[PDB]
Amino acid sequence: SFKPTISVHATPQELSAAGCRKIVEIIEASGSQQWPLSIALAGGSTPKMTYARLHDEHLNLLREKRALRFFMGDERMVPADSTDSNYNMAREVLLHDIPDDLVFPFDTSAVTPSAEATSADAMRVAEAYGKQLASLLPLKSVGEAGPKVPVFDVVLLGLGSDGHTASIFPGSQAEKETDGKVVVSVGFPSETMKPKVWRVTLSPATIMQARNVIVLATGAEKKWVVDGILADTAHKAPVARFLRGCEGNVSFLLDKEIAE
Template sequence: MTTRSRLKIRVAKDRTELRRLAAEVLAKKIRSAIQARGRCSLALSGGSTPGPVYEELGGSDLADDVPWSQLEIYFADERAVPVDHPESTYRLVKETLLQKHPEVLGQMFRMPADAADRDAAAKRYARRLPDPIDVLVLGMGPDGHTASLFPGSPALDEREQRVVAVTAPKPPPERMTVTPTVIERARSIVMIVAGAEKAAMLSRALNGIVDPKAIPAQLARRATWIVDQEAAAGLSL
């Protein structure tokens, strides 16, 4: 594992090490939030990279040190699909992080991206979403998007609403996402990035000109970035 001091970047040698490292960081941040405030609001993202991390946190020895009864789970974004759909982030979290902790399901608040009136549902979710979030977990796509904030999206200019319905340029297109305000106000952010296909964008995000409208992941530059060696190939460490 390699650590870079100026930006908070931790590089794992492979996805197995990344899975463990990210889970350890999350467990520590959750405990710290609970020690400070009695509860922890944890907002999660979906995708192929964080799934194994959630599984490690919920299913390994790390789970023994997580005060599950004091944890509230929210979502950074969600696709407009049923809860049992393979693309559902709610389903991902239920089947990984909470597979061995079903008692926590009542403390998980689904983002209703499939509601008939998505704009109204987004406003309701924003009212439920704590401000600020204690721990926010994000990922980054090869195009630089994070949550469901894609390059050039009008949602990047949103400053009044904390949650909005959006149409993404990749399937499934209909989604709901937190806005930049939520990311900027989060007490702690963990950004998890893996894969050679993200190396060029990761280099731009961390070493290039700061322009969140072009690279939304730059909204989280202050995050703890946990990346694998493939994704870090373009970084000077």
């Protein structure tokens, strides 16, 4: 059934060290002929620290050595220089140093600060990204018969207290996109989550085809979420329970609390 790897870390500087260690280890295990490996980045302070660690400790591996091709697993429909942009964050801590031919943020260039984006806009950005992905990454039939989705080597994920991952929110349509017909979907945050802006996100089908999925999550308030992914039988399941269906390697980098 479901056996992900789980490791617990007392501090942020410890989990960030393991997150970055885990990526490097996947990078080395793959060897240079496989590079660049594709990785879908997540937003949030935990990954942020992991990025800064790669920036400080393995720039050479990524720049001179071109180990990874960076993508965004989910994004806020705001301008790229907005502080609410996942890319903005990623770029501030790491990507301003990564070759441009190895960085692929979402195209939010039509999003201005005068008019909030709608689902119409998010859908446009998603379709376009889906196209780039199919052109850049390997495609794989879903269920050996089904439609074609791109295969990432690595997807970094976060988890919210509403049990969502990436920008795939409870009750959402994105959440239902598991058959492969939709590679990048759309979604609006639930009540307890901010910023209140439309999102684009890798669908669950795309994520379940990734070769490695690494979830970093802290907080006692997110424990129900992990508990709910790991349970034998689904009961009042969080959205993230779909991760159970991941075809590749799943790992949880957890703090002491969310673990307990």
